[PDB]
Design an enzyme around this catalytic site. Sequence first.
Site, PDB file in Angstrom:
ATOM      1  N   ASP A 106      23.926  74.091  32.373  1.00 28.77           N
ATOM      2  CA  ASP A 106      23.375  75.376  32.180  1.00 28.77           C
ATOM      3  C   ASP A 106      24.383  76.473  32.583  1.00 28.77           C
ATOM      4  O   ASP A 106      25.473  76.526  32.551  1.00 28.77           O
ATOM      5  CB  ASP A 106      21.917  75.594  32.478  1.00 28.77           C
ATOM      6  N   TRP A 107      23.598  77.324  33.164  1.00 31.93           N
ATOM      7  CA  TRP A 107      24.358  78.515  33.345  1.00 31.93           C
ATOM      8  C   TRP A 107      25.438  78.177  34.801  1.00 31.93           C
ATOM      9  O   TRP A 107      26.331  79.051  35.076  1.00 31.93           O
ATOM     10  CB  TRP A 107      23.495  79.873  34.022  1.00 31.93           C
ATOM     11  N   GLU A 130      24.550  69.372  29.177  1.00 30.03           N
ATOM     12  CA  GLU A 130      23.701  70.635  28.734  1.00 30.03           C
ATOM     13  C   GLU A 130      24.270  71.978  29.262  1.00 30.03           C
ATOM     14  O   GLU A 130      23.591  72.810  29.779  1.00 30.03           O
ATOM     15  CB  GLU A 130      22.281  70.313  29.065  1.00 30.03           C
ATOM     16  N   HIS A 270      16.836  69.217  27.768  1.00 28.76           N
ATOM     17  CA  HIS A 270      17.849  70.104  28.555  1.00 28.76           C
ATOM     18  C   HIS A 270      18.075  69.850  30.182  1.00 28.76           C
ATOM     19  O   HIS A 270      19.128  69.731  30.479  1.00 28.76           O
ATOM     20  CB  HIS A 270      17.375  71.695  28.253  1.00 28.76           C
TER      21      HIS A 270
HETATM   22 CL   LIG Z   1      19.050  81.139  29.922  1.00 29.83          CL
END
Ligand SMILES: [Cl-]
Length: 294
Positions: A106-107, A130, A270
């Site tokens: 993710d981030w 992801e 996710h």
């Molecule tokens: Cl987000």
Amino acid sequence: LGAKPFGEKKFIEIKGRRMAYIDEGTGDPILFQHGNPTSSYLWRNIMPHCAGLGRLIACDLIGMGDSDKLDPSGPERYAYAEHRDYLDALWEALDLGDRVVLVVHDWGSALGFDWARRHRERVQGIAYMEAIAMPIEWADFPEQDRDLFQAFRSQAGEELVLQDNVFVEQVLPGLILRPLSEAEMAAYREPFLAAGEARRPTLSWPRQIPIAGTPADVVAIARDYAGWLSESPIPKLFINAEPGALTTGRMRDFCRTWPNQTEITVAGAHFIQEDSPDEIGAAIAAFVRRLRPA
Ligand SMILES: [Cl-]
Ligand SMILES: [Ca+2]
Ligand SMILES: [Ca+2]
Ligand SMILES: [Ca+2]
């Protein structure tokens, strides 16, 4: 599985704020970076598989996990650029050396990919899953969560997140296939128990996703590391997920063109770390053992 954290949390002052992180073992680092709305806790059942392969590190982004909150906080706080300033400083303070293996999500992948591009000579390998591998369009965003994220990116975001903690209480469990225990959810909501600005990082993040050209600065940054990664010969490990979520469709097609890359598929949406930690850990361990033969 297990709800117990990997190692004890360590603290270090960065730019006047205290940041928390896990740092176990010695040797070249295997750096695990979480995204939104998680923390180092996300890697608790994965890091064990890398025991003896190096220095295992997992940092809590500013305003998340056990790291200090920024104050005063508001709509302009916790943007990608700000997170990068703190993470860059923390990673510098940790004395990582020049043979770092990054494990991102993710981030954490946006931050990790950008750091890698800027410090490419120090990156031994990159494992991702992801991730935010490139700027996308709304048609590329998971259909079931499309409306909700558009809402986060509107004036309704504050109520959804700051008041009702939707990212932590709804999105997180909603994108994990197996049921979480009381202990696990307690660990995830702990940094956001108080309504208000304490939850700001979980709202600023979705507003920073490079979608349909906005925000322009993050779109540019992602455009940059996307191009670089598509050309870099640095060894890569792509952990694909089924059904997956963010890294599907066009983004997945794009990631699959990246050079010197090994790929495996694991069950998950996710936050796949909560669904297939052993498969993920084993794959990362194998990847690192090939990168650090002996
Ligand atoms: Cl987000
Ligand atoms: Ca060395
Ligand atoms: Ca809409
Ligand atoms: Ca679920």
